[PDB]
Amino acid sequence: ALKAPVVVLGAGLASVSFVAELRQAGYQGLITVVGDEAERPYDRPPLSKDFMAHGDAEKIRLDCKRAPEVEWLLGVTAQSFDPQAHTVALSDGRTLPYGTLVLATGAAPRALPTLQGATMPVHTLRTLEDARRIQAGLRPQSRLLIVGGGVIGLELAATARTAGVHVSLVETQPRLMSRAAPATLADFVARYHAAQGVDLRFERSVTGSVDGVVLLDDGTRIAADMVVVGIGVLANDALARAAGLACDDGIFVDAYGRTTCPDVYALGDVTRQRNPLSGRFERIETWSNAQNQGIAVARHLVDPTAPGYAELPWYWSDQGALRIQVAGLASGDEEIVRGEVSLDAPKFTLIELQKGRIVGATCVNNARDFAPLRRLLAVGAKPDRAALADPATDLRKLAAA
């Protein structure tokens, strides 16, 4: 069960949500949190959004009030832990004893080889320090080159374009958001950005850089005042790999957050868990998972009677005039399109069914519909289809079932 003292490695959203719940759930023993970043815990979503505008870090901190009597060692790096001795080695020479150790060390932005040394600025966007460096070089008319058509990339493009900056983007795949988005949505998102002035380069990839210019695998090149790489992340599982835990670019855990090493748990971006919708193990790297999974695992540690994590995946993405929300899977048997798909009236909903069962949904500028659809997906609803394609009230249909 829950052996004290509790030691959490990492101080991001997963860590803060987990420790807050431990307390709320009634745990009153010792709790210590080790954060390598010398920063008061903050949320990352704003780093590519509003923060890029106001640059106010006090407007994006996380609320640790729900987590009383917790000692946060910020600026300190957990160098390793001994699972037999039940201790953690810190970078300041200290050692922390633990009864129950949690690894919520998240992940880190994948680096871009070829751009090794490329004279001009080259950043990744993961931290507040990153956010700050990039924000600086976002001077108007300047030229920004984004490598990666993922969510960080398109969110920065919108913010870069929204500030008089010029934007160019390179993607290796034939479409954007290849990772977790319906193709229907990607074609549109691509259409939207191109329309906002973004130079999209598909099936292209950066091969190098020679004096403030970038080389592409298409024999061509592109000039840029600053390059921001957004090509995915890698789990910060180095410590678990060394302590012999089971992992492969992410730590494997069950619905209780258990790793293959006794008394050691893991949550957040740093883990590969089961997707209840695809029945496959994968790394769910979303804000909702970071928070929801932390609480779930904390809730069960304090009370074994409580169920394991079961929340279904979903996430949002703010890209300029596009308020996107994607839940469940990106495809299935068929997809129903509620509303019209136009660059002028950007407002619509996509529903992904598998053999009649809703397995995913996408809401563009339509938050009213998201909540009910998540409810219907939550129960694998098998609603009409015709009533599902025409102006019916989902809140209601959801209410019916």
Instruction: State which of positions 49-78 bind ligand FAD (CB under 6 A).
Output: 77-78
Question: How many Cα neighbours within 13 Å face the side chain of 291?
Answer: 10
Residue 171 binding result from ligand FAD, ligand NAD, none, given CB thresholds of 5 to 8 Å by partner type? ligand NAD
- Report chain breaks in the chain, C–N > 2.5 Å, as residues after which they occur: none
Is 117 marked within a binding site?
no
Distances from the Cα of 324 to the Cαs of 93, 131, 265, in angstroms? Answer: 46, 22, 33
Q: Which amino acid is residue 161, in one-letter code?
A: R
Evaluated on CA atoms 258, 260, 263, 264, the torsion sign reads negative
Using the contact rule CB under 6 A, the part of the chain among 9-17, 175-183, 248-256, 385-393 near ligand FAD is: 9-17
Residue 325 binding result from ligand FAD, ligand NAD, none, given CB thresholds of 5 to 8 Å by partner type? none
Q: Which of 267, 265, 328 is nearest to 292 (CA)?
A: 267
Q: Which of 257, 268, 313, 328 binds ligand FAD (CB under 6 A)?
A: 268
Give, as one character, the DSSP assignment of residue 61.
B
What stretch of H or E contains 85?
none
CA distance 100 to 106: 18
Instruction: Measure CA 280 to chain center.
Output: 18
Is 187 marked within a binding site?
no
Using Cβ positions, the residue closest to ligand NAD within the complex turns out to be 150
Are 127 and 263 within 8 A, CB to CB? no
Give least dist CB 1 to ligand FAD, A. 24
Is 137 marked within a binding site?
no
3-state secondary structure labels for all residues of 43-57: CCHHHHCCHHHHCCH
Maximum alpha-carbon separation in the chain: 65
Are 144 and 225 within 8 A, CB to CB? yes
- Strand-pairing partners, residue 235, are 107
Using the contact rule CB under 6 A, the part of the chain among 110-118, 309-317, 321-329, 357-365 near ligand FAD is: 309-317
The answer to whether 104 contacts ligand FAD (rule: CB under 6 A) is: yes
3-class SS of residue 295: helix
Is 161 marked within a binding site?
no
Nearer to ligand FAD, 7 or 336 (CB): 7
Is 179 marked within a binding site?
yes
Using the contact rule CB under 6 A, the part of the chain among 159-167, 249-257, 281-289, 369-377 near ligand FAD is: 281-289
Give least dist CB 162 to ligand FAD, A. 16
The answer to whether 251 contacts ligand FAD (rule: CB under 6 A) is: no
Q: Would you tell me which residues interact with ligand FAD (CB under 6 A)?
A: 9-15, 34-37, 44-45, 47-48, 77-78, 104-107, 125-126, 152, 236, 239, 268-270, 285-288, 290, 315-317
Residues flagged as binding site for ADP: 110, 152, 171, 179, 232
Residues that constitute the known binding site for NADH? 149, 151-152, 171, 179, 232, 285
* Binding site feature residues for NAD(+): 110, 126, 151-152, 155, 171, 179, 232, 269, 285, 316
